[PDB]
Structures are given as structure tokens and as C-alpha cells.
Amino acid sequence: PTSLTNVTIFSPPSDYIVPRTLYPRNEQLPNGDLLATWENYSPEPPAVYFPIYRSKDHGKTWNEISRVHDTVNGYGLRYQPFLYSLPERVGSFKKGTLLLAGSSIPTDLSSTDIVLYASQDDGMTWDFVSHIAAGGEARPNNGLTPVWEPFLLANKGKLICYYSDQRDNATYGQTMVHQVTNDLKNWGPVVEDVTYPTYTDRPGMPVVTKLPNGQYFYVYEYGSFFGTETYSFPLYYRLSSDPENIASAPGQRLVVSSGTQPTSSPYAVWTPYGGENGTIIVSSGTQGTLFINKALGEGEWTEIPCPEEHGYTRALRVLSEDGGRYLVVNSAGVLLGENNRVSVSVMDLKEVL
Q1: Rounded to an integer, what distance in angstroms lies between the CA atom of residue 307 and that of residue 195?
Q2: Which of 195, 185, 116 is closest to 152 using CA atoms?
Q3: Do residues 180 and 173 lie in contact, with contact meaning Cβ atoms separated by under 8 Å?
Q4: How many independent structural domains does the chain possess?
Q5: Spatial distance between the Cα atoms of 298 and 192, rounded to a whole number of angstroms
Q6: How many whole angstroms separate alpha carbon 38 and alpha carbon 290?
Q7: 3 state DSSP class of 38
Q8: How many CA atoms lie within 13 A of 211 on its CB side?
């Protein structure tokens, strides 16, 4: 791999509906190939889908290889995709099964349904596997009951889906939860992970990375007034060595040594590069820079430059090559952007950390 800056994965046609693209997610397959997807705001009918673009040259070039269509509901696979190559067998699904989770939503935004698709051929073909969790109207207003934003992680023969939940609307504006499965078909009960006792609090957007000491780094945006008249979405994290037990961990505000206060839609990854504990790398949805931590989340975070533009839930990935030397930084644009596109940069962590 090499350093790359602002490579276009997809530039949408102007007849796509603003924002046209949003919400980048990606995966690296064991052979090193990179896959990318996003919310694809094509005019309907037919129903929206999640496109799957591949790079076989470490991000230099990209080509569409498949599309994940809403074969289960016919509504459209509309919001919040997530790609995940299983690192171990789960039930009847071998290691290397490629999963997509994402939300099936009708055009009228009346409902949400996080569904799970699988591919056994590295993203060429797809089949519906299960519903994970369904809810109400797909708008982030209090009193509504949607579900949102799946994140998938396997551990001990199980798959965990973390997501944001508005269904307990009598008690919380929003929570984050998870469900677990040992077969991808049958999901356990909803487990509350992050809840707060002020109704107007809206923690959301869970992203997890495993650390080399066995702790899991669980990052989220914490929407709150914090007792003031002004709402914000600062980044918080919880640390636990049990990825199914988050509620018992106190939240920790991410503090940056420069004084930048990162907000919205985090993403976190870990590389072995940078020191004896490696480096945790975090993005927000608001800042173009990156935030790093060489002490497993202790102390303060160092803000570093980044050549990729800022964007909503900008996605990070530590590529496997050379033992974690290269970082993908992948944007799909800004909220309600008039000129969104899907792009990627690759940074050489040997040099930038």
C-alpha cells in the first residue's frame, strides 16, 4: 500500500436526491481486498440499495461488484449499512462469510428494520438471513421509536449487533443496546448498554474496537444539554473486557490535548503501530483531523492532521498489511450536502504517528 489522498470511489449523478451519498462503511477481506458501501440516494422506484465497490490495489481504483437489494421487505435498504467479514465461524456460517447489516425503510420513512444479509463469495452475491431489530419512524425526533446504526462484532462463536434504540420512548430519548446470536438467525433479547437518567439525553452511534490487552473500546456520541441551554454531541467511550457488558462501565469524555472538543458520529480503530500499546485512532463527524491515543485510552488524545475531508460518520480502517501500517479514512459526505461524493485517503502510520 501507499499513501493516497482523496481518491474518488463514487461520484453520484446529479439526479440522486440530496445528500446523494452518506454514511460510509467498509471492510477488508482476508486476502487484502477492500470493499466500500454507503447510503445511496437513488430516485425511486425501484427501491434503494446498498452498492458494493471493491478495490484490489489498496484503494487506488474502485469498481462496483454487486448491490444489496431489499429482497425481504421491498422498502429499500436505505440507512446505516455495515459490512463485516466474520473472523470466526458463527453457527452454520463459516469464517469469511461476508455480512451486511443495514436498515430497510420505506420511502415515507414510516418504519425501521435492521436486516442481515450474507455473501459466501466475497461480496458477489447476497442472501437475506434475518431481521435483527425493527422499530418506528426513521426520524431522530423524541417520542418516536426507530432503531438505527448497526455495528457488528463477533466473539466466542457469537455475533453481537450494537445499535441505537428509541423504542423505550417513555423513559429515554434514545439509548444504545445490543442483541446476540449464535447462528445469525435467532437473536437474543435486547440488552441495554448505554442509558441516561435525563430524558433529553441521546447517546448514539456505537462503534467498538478491541484493544491488545483484551479491553474493548466502545465509543459513541453523547447527545445532551449537560444541564445547560445548549445541546451538543461530544465523543464518549466506555471500556470493558466483556463486549456484552457495557452498562456497568462509566462513560469517559474523550479529551484532546489541543482543546478541540470533537463532536458527532465517531469511528474508532486500533493499530499495533506507534508504540508498545499500539494506537487507538478516532474520527468524529465534525472535525477533519484525527485523534490518537498511545495509552489504551488513558490521558488525553493527540489531534493530528488528516488529508481526507470531514464527513458524517467518517469511517476508519487499519489495513492488515505490514502489520497495521496503513490507515483508510473514508468519507461519503456531509449531512444534506449539495456536492457529496464517496472518497478515501490512505495514511502511512509509520510516518504520521
Answers
A1: 35
A2: 116
A3: no
A4: 1
A5: 26
A6: 21
A7: strand
A8: 26
The domain of 183 spans 1-353
- C-beta separation of 126 from 118 below 8 A: yes
- The label of the residue with cell 459526505 reads 333
Whether 333 contacts 311, CB under 8 Å: yes
Cell numbers 463527524 correspond to what residue? Answer: 285
Quickly count: other Cβ atoms within 10 Å of residue 251's Cβ. Answer: 15
In angstroms, the Cα distances linking 118 to 68, 179, 221 are 10, 18, 29
The dihedral through the CA atoms of 211, 278, 55, 334 has a sign that is positive
Give 22's contacts (C-beta < 8 A, 6+ positions apart).
38, 39, 41, 312, 332, 333, 335, 337, 340
Residue 36, all three cell numbers: 466500500
Please, which experimental method was used? Answer: X-ray
Which parts of the chain fold into alpha helices (H)?
Answer: 321-324, 349-352
Q: What is the number of residues in the chain?
A: 353
Positive or negative, the CA dihedral 217, 334, 29, 48 is positive
What is the torsional sign of CA 334, 335, 337, 342?
A: positive
Q: What is the CATH number of the domain that holds 280?
A: 2.120.10.10
Q: Can you say how many angstroms the Cα of residue 305 is from the centroid of all Cα atoms in its chain?
A: 22
Task: Return the closest-CA partner of residue 33 out of 92, 155, 121, 150.
Answer: 121
Q: Which residues of 206-228 are buried (b: 16+ CB within 10 A; e: fewer)?
A: bbbbebeeebbbbbbbbbbeeee
Task: Outline where DSSP puts E strands in 120-271.
Answer: 127-135, 147-155, 158-165, 175-181, 191-194, 202-210, 216-223, 235-240, 252-253, 267-271
* Residue tagged 455495528 (cell numbers): 151
The residue assigned the cell 476508519 is 316
DSSP letters for 172-213: -S-EEEEEEESSSSS----EEEE--SSTT-EEEEEEEEE-TT
Question: φ, ψ for residue 86 (rounded to 5)?
Answer: -60, 125
Contact 136, 127 (CB under 8 A): no
**What are the grid coordinates assigned to 132, written together?**
435483527
Residue that the C-alpha cell 463514487 belongs to: 10
Closest of 39, 130, 136, 115 to residue 80, by C-alpha? 39
